Design a binder for this molecule. Structure first.
Ligand SMILES: O=c1ccn([C@@H]2O[C@H](COP(=O)(O)OP(=O)(O)O)[C@@H](O)[C@H]2O)c(=O)[nH]1
Ligand SMILES: OC[C@H]1O[C@H](O)[C@H](O)[C@@H](O)[C@@H]1O
Ligand SMILES: [Mn+2]
Length: 541
């Protein structure tokens, strides 16, 4: 399963009676010396593969009317196969680090209780829980602002709360306008202050703002900052403000854009996590992820037919937490819908086990390609809630580059829109017009997905983050890898290509309670339920 030799290819692209051009002879040359490269690093072999590819597309280019073009194009495919061979066969130890991120406010007990499960079965792994010591008040800032906007929109309706269609669609639309205006009022303040006193940290600007505009007590905010700092210190805290390579890189301004202006802590988390992986190596996990259940644990209990495979994965966890109680206040919602007979079997199995290690598996020694970042999977494809990479992996670099390039395209259209000082609607329309003018056949779908950006976290079903800093940057990077290029914007890879980068399902339990509620986004059914709750509160409060 090695790949084609110098004269093995030379008989493949043999065209009768016609001379061998310089750029063709370069392919063969580079190909032979690749086979003498069993001294070189895994990266050096990829870069030799990239170049053979860069010479082959340059041979075709110059000779559009060449008989070699059929074999020259079949060779380009053999090169892809070889990357996949280079990746799977040449594995190095993954650094024993677990990376979590919680930024924007205090860490809640739930996250720590999830994190501690990883701690309890991975004593040989170092754990970082990343926080930003300048920015404990963003979550407070957003919540105050959203609630102020909730109350203002309801003040607008009220005499029309009954009817007709002052429905949940209309509410979130109006609320968006108010939110935009408040956010832009804060952003303007932030920038006025940073220009005046460049020494002021995020939280200083924020608490002064909350005091001036929402009558919050600075003393209580200060107390909150001090408690949050103490709590994260007690829990493997690691400060973004001491991560120097991150502070000084080209992604820090983007990270702050998301933190300070957009209040999207998931997008800020996306930008930081890949950088942690690039700089330290190891395994990244969202705080709503729990260890993998032992393969042979529930092997005696059979999934009944009246149950989703995903319902079953949820119940497996809930049965562990009902009987072993590892995580307090874990839901039993789905477990309780089972039979007597089926609930009995779970207790009976969760009985013969005494150690947490008989329930949850350990990561132990892991290995990956110096080329790759491994990514978790769910039914909708790849997902960056789990990631594995060795320090300075080739992909970690390609993913960083993808994210920065995606932001460069966004900010190029967004910023001129914003720096005209208009309301939500006009700014949206200018922004979209601009995105539309810069769109082309290469970046089309991605551009369509960018136009909802001003609404992220504030309106139902707005997922822009996925295309900017999330899973799509990862797919683009894998395509960069497999196509010997950089800057893919048009994803043509299918499921089978991406499967090469999967973390095995046994290493993570993804079907957790906290996974089932998104911190940066919300669907329509949730938006409807929220609307109705807010009306009641307004009526009763
Ligand atoms: O206030 C917040 C909210 C989210 N996050 C980060 O964003 C990640 C993704 O959150 P979530 O799992 O809700 O996103 P989802 O899986 O629904 O896309 C979390 O794990 C945290 O790392 C954060 O740091 N602070
Ligand atoms: O990229 C946006 C989000 O996408 C995914 O759903 C991940 O669960 C989360 O870690 C990330 O923040
Ligand atoms: Mn999640």
């Amino acid at each position: 399963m090695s790949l084609v030799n110098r004269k093995q290819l030379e008989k493949m692209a043999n065209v009768r009676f016609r001379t061998q051009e310089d750029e063709y002879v370069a392919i063969l040359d580079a190909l032979e010396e690749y086979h003498n490269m069993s001294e070189n690093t895994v990266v050096e072999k990829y870069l030799k593969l990239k170049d053979i590819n860069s010479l082959t597309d340059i041979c075709i280019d110059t000779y559009k009317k060449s008989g070699r073009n059929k074999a020259l194009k079949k060779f380009k495919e053999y090169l892809v196969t070889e990357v996949l061979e280079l990746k799977n066969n040449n594995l190095t130890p993954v650094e024993k680090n677990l990376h979590f991120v919680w930024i924007g406010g205090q860490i809640n007990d739930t996250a720590i209780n999830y994190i501690n499960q990883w701690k309890d079965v991975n004593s040989d792994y170092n754990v970082n829980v990343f926080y930003d010591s300048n920015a404990f008040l963003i979550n407070t800032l957003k919540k105050t602002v959203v609630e102020s906007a909730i109350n203002d929109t309801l003040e607008s309706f009220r005499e029309n709360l009954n009817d007709p269609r002052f429905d949940y669609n209309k509410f979130f639309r109006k609320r968006m306008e108010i939110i935009y205006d408040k956010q832009k009022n804060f952003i303007n303040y932030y920038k006025a202050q940073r220009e005046e006193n460049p020494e002021l940290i995020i939280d200083d600007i924020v608490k002064t703002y909350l005091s001036n505009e929402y009558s919050k007590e600075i003393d209580e905010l200060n107390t909150y900052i001090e408690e949050s700092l103490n709590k994260i210190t007690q829990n493997s805290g690691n400060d973004v403000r001491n991560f120097g390579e991150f502070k000084n890189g080209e992604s820090f301004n983007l990270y702050e854009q998301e933190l300070v202006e957009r209040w999207n802590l998931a997008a800020a988390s996306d930008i930081l996590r890949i950088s942690a992986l690039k700089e330290i190596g190891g395994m990244y996990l969202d705080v709503d992820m729990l260890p993998g259940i032992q393969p042979d644990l529930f092997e005696s209990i059979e999934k009944p037919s009246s149950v989703t495979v995903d319902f079953w994965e949820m119940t497996k966890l809930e049965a562990i937490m009902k009987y072993k109680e590892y995580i307090p206040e874990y839901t039993s919602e789905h477990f309780d819908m089972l039979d007597e007979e089926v609930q009995s079997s779970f207790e009976s199995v969760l009985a013969s086990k005494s150690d947490k290690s008989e329930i949850f598996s350990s990561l132990g020694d892991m290995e990956a390609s110096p080329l790759e970042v491994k990514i978790a999977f769910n039914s909708k494809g790849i997902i960056n809630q789990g990631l594995i990479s060795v320090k300075d992996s080739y992909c970690s670099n390609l993913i960083v580059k993808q994210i920065e390039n995606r932001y460069k395209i966004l900010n190029n259209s967004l910023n001129p829109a914003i720096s005209e000082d208009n309301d939500f609607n006009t700014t949206t329309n200018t922004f979209i017009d601009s995105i539309m003018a810069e769109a082309n056949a290469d970046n089309g779908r991605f551009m369509m997905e960018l136009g909802k950006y001003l609404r992220v976290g504030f309106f139902p079903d707005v997922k822009t983050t996925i295309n900017l800093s999330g899973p799509e940057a990862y797919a683009a990077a894998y395509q960069d890898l497999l196509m010997f290029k950089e800057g893919s914007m048009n994803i043509h890879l299918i499921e089978a290509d991406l499967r090469n980068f999967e973390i095995s399902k046994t290493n993570i339990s993804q079907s957790t309670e906290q996974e089932m509620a998104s911190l940066w986004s919300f669907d329509d059914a949730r938006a409807k339920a929220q609307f109705e709750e807010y009306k009641r509160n307004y009526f009763e409060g």
